[PDB]
Design a protein around this motif. Structure first.
Motif, short mmCIF file in Angstrom:
data_model
loop_
_atom_site.label_atom_id
_atom_site.label_comp_id
_atom_site.label_asym_id
_atom_site.label_seq_id
_atom_site.Cartn_x
_atom_site.Cartn_y
_atom_site.Cartn_z
N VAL A 185 5.70 -15.07 6.68
CA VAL A 185 6.36 -16.12 5.91
C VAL A 185 7.87 -16.10 6.17
CG1 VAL A 185 4.50 -15.78 4.26
CG2 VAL A 185 6.78 -14.97 3.67
N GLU A 186 8.42 -14.92 6.50
CA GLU A 186 9.80 -14.85 6.97
C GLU A 186 9.92 -15.45 8.37
OE1 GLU A 186 10.89 -12.64 9.58
OE2 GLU A 186 13.05 -12.99 9.36
N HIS A 187 8.88 -15.29 9.19
CA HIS A 187 8.93 -15.69 10.60
C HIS A 187 8.88 -17.21 10.80
N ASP A 188 8.48 -17.91 9.74
CA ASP A 188 8.30 -19.38 9.83
C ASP A 188 7.24 -19.63 10.89
OD1 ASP A 188 8.44 -22.11 9.89
OD2 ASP A 188 10.50 -22.22 10.66
N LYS A 189 7.69 -19.78 12.12
CA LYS A 189 6.79 -19.95 13.26
C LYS A 189 6.16 -18.59 13.49
N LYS A 190 4.90 -18.40 13.11
CA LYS A 190 4.23 -17.10 13.39
C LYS A 190 4.53 -16.66 14.83
N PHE A 191 4.54 -15.35 15.10
CA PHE A 191 4.90 -14.86 16.46
C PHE A 191 3.65 -14.74 17.35
CE2 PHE A 191 8.71 -12.83 14.14
CZ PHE A 191 9.40 -14.01 14.20
N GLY A 192 2.55 -14.15 16.86
CA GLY A 192 1.30 -14.09 17.65
C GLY A 192 0.47 -12.85 17.36
N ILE A 193 -0.83 -12.85 17.71
CA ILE A 193 -1.67 -11.71 17.35
C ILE A 193 -2.77 -11.66 18.41
CG2 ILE A 193 -3.49 -11.03 15.69
CD1 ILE A 193 -1.61 -11.31 13.47
N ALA A 196 12.81 -12.87 18.62
CA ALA A 196 12.16 -12.94 17.32
C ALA A 196 11.33 -11.71 17.00
CB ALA A 196 11.29 -14.20 17.24
N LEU A 197 10.87 -10.98 18.03
CA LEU A 197 10.18 -9.71 17.82
C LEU A 197 11.06 -8.68 17.13
N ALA A 198 12.37 -8.72 17.38
CA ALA A 198 13.29 -7.85 16.66
C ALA A 198 13.53 -8.34 15.24
CB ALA A 198 14.62 -7.74 17.42
N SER A 199 13.39 -9.65 15.02
CA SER A 199 13.66 -10.24 13.70
C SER A 199 12.65 -9.76 12.66
CB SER A 199 13.65 -11.76 13.81
OG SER A 199 12.33 -12.26 13.88
N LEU A 200 11.36 -9.95 12.93
CA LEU A 200 10.31 -9.30 12.15
C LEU A 200 10.07 -7.93 12.77
#
Lengths: 292, 155, 54, 43
Positions: free
Chosen positions: B33-41, B67-71
């Motif tokens: 929810v912080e990432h807004d645009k989910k990063f991936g799984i 963005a990987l560093a962000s989350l």
């Protein structure tokens, strides 16, 4: 001189574990206060509101390895086992296996699903009257084996002397404290209903089977043919079977049944890597006998 | 669009599915929810279709190499350091498999035809407790290739 | 047979006996009755053989 | 297709006497089929 195993080859355990009984404790008041953790009807076993700690009490009986062979239908095979064990008593005094067993006390792997979800887990080991200094189990990892810690080496040297024959019995009593918090589950051991998850009840309380705790101490095997591909300690079974996965680590060549037949029959010196596994199957016990 | 190495260690007592479903996946839910645009799984080794574990390595990939560093999944999963080990690297990741949320129908009483379709999904089953009202049920997965995750990490 | 059994578990029924936490010893109580050796021949179909043994 | 979760059950068993006929079959659920094939096991 020999050509087979006898028709009655049974061994007895050299590491006898008690059943576990549980308690409810408060970590500040912990050395003066102990209530039971009765089972609450499935079956859940959740701590009361006030207490925050889980006292896990259990003991270990340590017996010699030479004096631990119930049946041997041929005296040649008995003499061969006694000479091979005299070799391991010479090389290393059951010190590697002893350090590994005291490590699976130190890592608190006898807590199976009780380990996660706790800030602090201490484990006090008492031998006779000497209460050996406490163990910070949340510093050891369940994939590594410390050989430098001093309390571990002291307990391992007494376990080693007993496993050799320099001592008859070593009664080790181990208490543990698990701060999993309050109103959270404790997950005791499950009984095998043969006809719902009815859990274990020892003396009007809760606890774990001795069979599970002794599996937890037996996770000392890092000698399998594939220690690079997979890098985790496996419980030391004959046809080595990590049931976390479905991978037969010792499926044939390095199985105990085809290892004990090459140190006694086609008498062949083996590396020290598999020698630990043979004299750690001889610490678990089992009927290792051939048909005819 | 790179990825980090999260390994659920083999062994350790507790099964991998429980460790993911109790530690990692609520962390992902509260950190997408912080990432807004989910990063991936991506779970490498989803294995076969008669059977099939989610696996032993979860690789969270993203649509950006920053963005990987962000989350920052590392140091947010330092309470599972004896169970899940977070390597510190990132390599450009389109060489993965996207994952989807096959729905699995509901029970009979919820409202015959149930089990006809229920026999497909019910054979990864990562469990989720609800941050909302509370009723908990496993969400189910699949291998799919659509490229460019939305809510939890599924498409 | 090893190929399809090695990863199959083995439920087994058993029984065991353990002491309690509050007790540390096992007490065994048994008795022995001693009887004469000459007066312990239930049957003998030859009195000469009974005389020889006596 | 045979309905998923259901097995053809020879009502009178094909070991304890029965005919391989449309009469001697009811498409019961796998749970109840397991119950009936265990009930007839203990007779």
């Amino acid at each position: 001189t020999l050509k087979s195993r006898p028709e009655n080859l049974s061994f007895a355990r050299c590491l006898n574990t008690t059943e576990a009984k549980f308690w409810q404790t408060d970590f500040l008041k912990r050395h003066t206060f102990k209530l039971p953790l009765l089972i609450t009807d499935s079956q859940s076993c959740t701590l009361s509101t006030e207490c925050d700690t889980l006292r896990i009490d259990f003991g270990i009986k340590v017996l010699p390895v030479k004096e631990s062979m119930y049946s041997c239908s041929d005296y040649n095979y008995r003499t061969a086992i006694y000479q091979k064990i005299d070799e391991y008593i010479a090389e290393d005094g059951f010190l590697t296996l002893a350090k590994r067993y005291v490590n699976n006390i130190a890592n608190a792997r006898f807590l199976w699903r009780n380990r996660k979800g706790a800030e602090i887990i201490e484990t006090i080991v008492t031998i006779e009257d000497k209460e050996y200094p406490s163990f910070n189990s949340k510093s050891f990892n369940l994939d590594t084996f410390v050989e430098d810690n001093a309390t571990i080496n002291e307990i391992a040297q007494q376990i080693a002397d007993t496993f050799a024959g320099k001592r008859e019995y070593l009664n080790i009593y181990v208490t543990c404290f698990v701060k999993i918090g309050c109103a959270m589950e404790v997950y005791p051991s499950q009984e095998m209903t043969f006809d719902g998850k009815k859990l274990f009840k020892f003396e009007g309380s809760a606890g774990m089977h001795s069979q599970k705790i002794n599996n937890a101490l037996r996770t000392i095997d890092t000698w399998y043919p594939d220690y690079t591909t997979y890098e985790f300690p496996i419980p030391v079974e004959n046809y080595g079977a990590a049931r976390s996965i479905g991978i037969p680590f010792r499926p044939d060549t390095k199985s105990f049944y085809k290892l004990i037949d090459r140190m006694i029959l086609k008498n062949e010196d083996l590396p020290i890597e598999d020698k630990h596994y043979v004299m750690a199957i001889l610490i678990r016990g089992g009927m290792f006998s051939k048909k005819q | 669009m790179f990825s980090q190495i999260l390994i659920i260690k083999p062994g350790t007592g507790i099964s991998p599915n429980i460790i993911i479903s109790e530690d990692i996946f609520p962390v992902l839910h509260s950190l997408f929810v912080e990432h807004d645009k989910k990063f991936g799984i991506t779970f490498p080794a989803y294995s076969f279709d008669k059977k099939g574990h989610l696996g032993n390595i979860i690789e969270v990939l993203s649509e950006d190499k920053e963005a990987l560093a962000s989350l920052c999944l590392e140091e947010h999963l330092a309470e599972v350091t004896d169970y899940v080990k977070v390597k510190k690297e990132i390599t450009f990741t389109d060489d993965y498999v996207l994952f989807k949320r096959i729905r699995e129908e509901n029970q009979y009483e919820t409202t015959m035809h149930i089990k006809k379709k229920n026999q497909q999904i019910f054979c990864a089953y990562i469990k989720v407790k609800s941050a909302s009202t509370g009723q908990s049920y496993n969400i189910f997965l699949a291998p799919t290739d659509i490229k460019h995750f939305s809510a939890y990490g599924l498409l | 047979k090893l190929e399809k059994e090695i990863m199959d578990p083995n439920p087994q029924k058993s029984q065991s006996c353990t002491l309690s936490t509050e007790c540390d010893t096992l007490r065994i109580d048994f008795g022995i009755k001693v009887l004469p050796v000459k007066e312990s021949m239930y049957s003998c179909s030859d009195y000469n053989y009974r005389t020889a043994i006596y | 297709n045979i309905p998923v979760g259901y097995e053809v059950h020879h009502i009178v068993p094909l070991s304890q006497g029965g005919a391989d006929s449309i009469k001697n079959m009811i498409m019961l659920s796998i749970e109840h089929h397991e119950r009936v094939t265990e009930a007839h096991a203990s007779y």
